């Protein structure tokens with residue numbers, strides 16, 4: 409639950425009352441393997457659902473990070489997929505990671521074969537406030553052509 | 566049900582995606598009856614939950630209105646409380662309208678006087694984007710001191 413009151417600050421001014429964060433019905437993303445090399449320097453965030461300095465952010469949001477140990481995807485604190493550097497450099501240049509987070513399960517794997525996919529068999533849907541990234545701005549065109557995408561569905565009642 | 570997609574434009578920039586409108590767990594309000602005396606010229610809205618130019622706002626929101634014909638409170642197009650301006654005139658000067666919108670029922674009445682309580686026994690909770698008003702600005706201290714208030718509890722986990 410979250411609360412909105414009115415009047416505010418001794419004033420009768422109309423106020424906006426948006427929901428700032430929520431657990432979605434579902435979240436899904438397609439992440440071209442190519443984005444790993446489109447990150448800004450000493451950055452690791454391909455995609456996040458909460459801003460960095462958010463409270464308990466890593467335990468609540470969904471995060472795709474790539475660094476020295478390879479790629480890591482967490483959702484609501486559960487590790488979803490884990491590829492070492494070894495595992496990464498072996499993936500075809502045109503590989504995509506498909507993420508799907510839903511009440512029943514969260515799965516992540518290479519859009520490709522099924523030997524690769526990783527399931528958490530439990531509800532671990534992230535908290536979301538938007539979509540955050542540390543990818544280079546100029547890389548938009550390459551990565552949109554490559555299939556970069558995130559999609560959140562929310563119920564409103 | 567709403568959607569959000571990313572990237573937006575042809576930009577990789579981060580985006581915030583707040584949920585703009587929803588149906589709350591509940592909405593409650595206390596509206597001093599002195600509020601009817603304190604509307605801006607030619608306006609009748611004491612409190613609404615959607616701005617006047619939302620599509621079907623009249624069908625979706627909750628509105629407390631006051632004009633020549635008295636006071637009406639509508640949510641989701643259902644008239645819960647009407648008070649003629651005669652009925653209004655016998656009320657004490659400190660009277661408060663109490664409203665409650667929950668999924669079980671929507672109640673509205675003169676607080677502390679359940680000879681006046683009106684209860685719509687369906688779920689008729691409003692859609693909410695905010696709290697809007699054409700109450701005069703200089704009325705803030707008078708109305709606040711009499712206990713003007715609206716309160717929305719929202720569920721953020723969605724099924």
Ligand SMILES: [Zn+2]
Pocket residue numbers: 467468484
């Ligand atoms: Zn949690």
Ligand SMILES: [Zn+2]
Pocket residue numbers: 526
């Ligand atoms: Zn495995």
Ligand SMILES: [Zn+2]
Pocket residue numbers: 624625640641642643689
């Ligand atoms: Zn209706």
Ligand SMILES: [Zn+2]
Pocket residue numbers: 642643644
């Ligand atoms: Zn009706």
Ligand SMILES: [Zn+2]
Pocket residue numbers: 593716717
């Ligand atoms: Zn309340």
